[PDB]
Design a protein around this ligand. Structure first.
Ligand code: WHG
Length: 284
């Protein structure tokens, strides 16, 4: 049976290579990658691929790989798809490890904006987990030269990671990774997938998709949120995306709110990630 080579960029930046039958569903590849990673809490994760417009798309595990990658390479990244609001409730330390790896990339890429102090805190927990107790015999030198902590490194940031690293003596790796996540989960952009859009009056906005719902940034403020509980139906038509909201108490009619996306593929991609979040993070 005819196999296609698959390459997967792992969260540590390394490459996993395997073959799958060309008619394979995404689940087949995802299962191989998660087995490679010893990952059992798979529900939070996914593979991404890049479409012909260079846009990030989730590989639907329930659909054929060939019908998603189409004319592109069988080239994927392993990513967190659903950021858990409380990482302490994950059952396995290794799940929390992979989530830390994703957040470290979210921070360095600048997708996850972060104060100086929180960049230093997060960096100090990572160094504690991976290097263990601070070596003071080092006293002023750069044993952290290989660690990337921020979109922009400064000497002051490096100094602050080191000062905080000294304070974590005796902390074990899972402990350090749990403290990393306790800080990161509180960041206002934690787990927020951002999409360029316009409102019904043509004003530039960003739509954020996350556990808590659909966020609208009408300025550079979170000027609004639609919690998944309020949302009855998500749809797209042409370059338009719509959310149908349940009637408020005593109100006669539902409401439908409409957004303009950059093109049709961008409207469909937003609809798909909203439906997925709405299902995964729905009130039960
Ligand atoms: C679009 C897609 C991605 C994530 N991966 C997909 C697999 N190839 C490498 C990039 N980033 O922008």
């Amino acid at each position: 049976p005819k196999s296609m080579q698959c390459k997967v960029i792992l969260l540590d930046g390394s490459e996993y290579t395997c073959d799958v039958e060309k008619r394979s569903r995404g689940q087949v590849l995802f299962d191989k990658v998660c087995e490679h990673l010893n990952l059992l809490e798979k529900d939070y994760f996914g593979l991404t691929y890049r479409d012909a417009e260079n846009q990030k798309n989730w590989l639907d595990p329930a659909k054929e790989i060939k019908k998603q990658v189409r004319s592109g390479a069988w080239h994927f990244s392993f990513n967190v798809k659903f950021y858990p609001p409380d990482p302490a409730q994950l059952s396995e330390d290794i799940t929390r490890y992979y989530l830390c790896l994703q957040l470290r990339d979210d921070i360095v890429s600048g997708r996850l904006p972060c104060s100086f102090v929180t960049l230093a805190l997060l960096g100090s927990y990572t160094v504690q987990s991976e290097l263990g107790d601070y070596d003071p015999d080092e006293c002023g030198s750069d044993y952290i030269s290989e660690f990337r902590f921020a979109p922009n490194h400064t000497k002051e940031l490096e100094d602050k990671v080191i000062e905080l690293h000294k304070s974590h003596r005796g902390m074990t790796p899972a402990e350090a990774e749990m403290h990393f996540l306790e800080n990161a989960k509180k960041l206002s952009m934690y787990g927020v997938d951002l999409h360029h859009a316009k409102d019904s009056e043509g004003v530039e906005i960003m739509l954020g998709v996350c556990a808590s719902g659909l966020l609208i940034y009408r300025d550079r403020l979170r000027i609004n949120r639609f919690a998944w509980p309020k949302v009855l139906k998500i749809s797209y038509k042409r370059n338009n995306f719509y959310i149908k909201i349940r009637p408020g108490e005593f109100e006669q009619f539902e409401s439908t709110i409409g957004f303009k996306l950059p093109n049709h593929r961008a409207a469909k991609r937003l609809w798909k990630v909203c439906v997925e979040h709405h299902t995964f993070f729905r009130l039960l």
